């Protein structure tokens, strides 16, 4: 039936529209004419020296404009102008006489978001995630299908997981996730760090953590990549010395973030921890962060594909066998792996021999291994 | 001499015009109008003659 009237109602549409429009155009004139006119006329209106800047707006018609000078005037609106563009702080176009607003234009913006999201679909996608399946399901589940299929949710019931943690080691894939689903994902995925938001004075890292989540409202509905927090807060301290205190009063504004008062949109939360258990039993709330997920060390069988994973764009030779390092039974983090390929390819360039050697891949073991 | 002498006197005559403004162009668009910095006041557009 909803199907139905739709089609009915978009039929009548092509028709009406095309076909009438049509007809006009055929007998295009009485419309070009009346364009330049209406163009004149507004070239006609003062478009001296020109600028303005928006304090505030009034109501229709009336509104406050500021200049350089502080040329706060109070000037009623031309109706000329775009309209509904005017949001405070925008800069607008004022007549050099009148001061009548008729234009505005900013075309600029801080470069935040340029710095905070850079190379959006890294080389890194689901086939370079070598293993770890179950993890890579339920973060999709979290994630992707309710944004590639707003459907299931909405005709079921429940909206969506809002904040997803990762925990595990130090190196898991954590990043590697997050940059696959970026990259899978057409939402403006949006990269942060815990060693930035840190700032020097009281107020500074609750002000960028606001700016952030509403960058990341507005721009796109995407996802947020907290990375390690447990550097930040690490719950609610007696709250003593006053740099901890600020770090709490930064957290709570992240938890007001993630489910406050008023509402959240659709942007996702995808948190990166090393250790979880020290993180604030409060922030992981149920109604807020859901979907913890474990990042395990790999196994022997997850060790064999993240190598033949990173070793794709890595011409092993025939000697060279991808056994040995399976052999370890240690700690083998993917960014072990990947230093492993990598330091074996640097020793076999150092010893001229354009193909790597099993020797070469064992001296890169050991050279690897800290510990 | 004679157009040298003639180039002095309606220097004279008709330097009492005001100059003009060094302004930085900040961004152009349509032929129409052209932004333009007018230091040291604030930025603005400005309608572009026929050079
Ligand atoms: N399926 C996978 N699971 C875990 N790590 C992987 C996988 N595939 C590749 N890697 C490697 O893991 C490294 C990234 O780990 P990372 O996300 O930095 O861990 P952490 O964020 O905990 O430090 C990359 O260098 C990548 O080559
Ligand atoms: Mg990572």
């Known amino acids: ?371 | 001499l004679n157009a040298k002498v003639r180039l002095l006197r309606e220097e004279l005559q008709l330097l009492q015009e005001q100059g003009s403004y060094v302004g930085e162009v900040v961004r152009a668009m349509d032929k129409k109008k052209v932004l333009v910095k007018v230091h040291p006041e604030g930025k603005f557009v400005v309608d572009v003659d026929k050079n």
């Open chain 1, 1 to 371: 039936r909803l199907k139905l009237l739709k089609l009915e109602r978009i039929k009548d549409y092509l028709l009406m529209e095309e076909e009438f429009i049509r007809n006009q155009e055929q007998m295009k004139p009485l419309e070009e004419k009346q364009e330049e006119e209406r163009s004149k006329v507004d070239d006609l209106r003062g478009t001296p020296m020109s600028v303005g800047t928006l304090e505030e707006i009034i109501d229709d018609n009336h509104a406050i404009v500021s200049t350089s000078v502080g040329s706060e005037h109070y000037v009623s609106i031309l109706s000329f102008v775009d309209k509904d563009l005017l949001e405070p702080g925008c800069s607008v176009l004022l007549n050099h006489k009148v001061h009548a607003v008729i234009g505005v234009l900013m075309d600029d913006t801080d470069p935040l978001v340029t710095v905070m999201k850079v190379e959006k679909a890294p080389q890194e996608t689901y086939a370079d995630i070598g293993g770890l399946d179950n993890q890579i399901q339920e973060i999709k589940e979290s994630v992707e299908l309710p944004l590639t299929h707003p459907e299931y949710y909405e005709e079921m019931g429940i909206k969506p997981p809002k904040g997803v943690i990762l925990y595990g080691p130090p190196g898991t894939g954590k990043t590697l996730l997050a940059k696959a689903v970026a990259n899978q994902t057409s939402a403006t995925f949006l990269r942060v760090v815990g060693s930035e938001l840190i700032q020097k004075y009281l107020g500074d890292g609750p002000k960028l953590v606001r700016e952030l989540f509403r960058v990341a409202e507005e721009h796109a509905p995407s996802i947020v990549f907290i990375d390690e927090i447990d550097a930040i807060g690490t719950k609610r301290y007696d709250s003593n010395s006053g740099g901890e205190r600020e770090i709490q009063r930064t957290m709570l504004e992240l938890l007001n973030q993630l489910d406050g008062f008023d509402s959240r949109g659709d942007v996702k939360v995808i948190m990166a921890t090393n250790r979880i258990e020290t993180l604030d039993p409060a922030l992981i709330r149920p109604g807020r962060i859901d979907r913890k997920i474990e990042f395990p060390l790999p196994d022997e069988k997850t060790k064999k594909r993240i190598f033949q994973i990173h070793t794709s764009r890595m011409t092993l030779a025939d000697d060279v066998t991808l056994d040995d390092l399976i052999m370890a039974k240690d700690d083998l983090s993917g960014a072990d792996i990947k230093a492993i390929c990598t330091e074996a390819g640097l020793m076999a360039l150092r010893e001229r021999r354009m193909k790597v050697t099993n020797e070469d891949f064992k001296k890169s073991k050991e050279n690897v291994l800290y510990k």
